[PDB]
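The freezer alarm interrupted the setup, so I double-checked each line after restarting. Inputs confirmed:
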Amino acid sequence: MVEADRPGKLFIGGLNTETNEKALEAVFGKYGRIVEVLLMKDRETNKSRGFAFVTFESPADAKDAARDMNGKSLDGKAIKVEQATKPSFESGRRG
RNA sequence: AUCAAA
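Predicted 3D structure, all chains:
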């Protein structure tokens, strides 16, 4: 299954545990007008899962970020930037 | 390793 949840949504893996949404809007907002930002975190420490997501208003403002910020760093920790895929903690059922 | 949303 090759799935990509529409242009403009990025996957931001390898982030610091100290990074949050404000740093993620502030850093990816440098490439395009953000419409949404995600930052994934532990449910007992509310830190970070070490990866996040962001939605741009243009599918190519996200390309310009995913062509600049990819392989760089956030809060001192090296990251990946790419078009986002769908989650994998859940699967189809019944039928 | 810079690997995916509870």
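Quick read of the result. Residues 16 and 76 of chain A are 7 Å apart (CA to CA).
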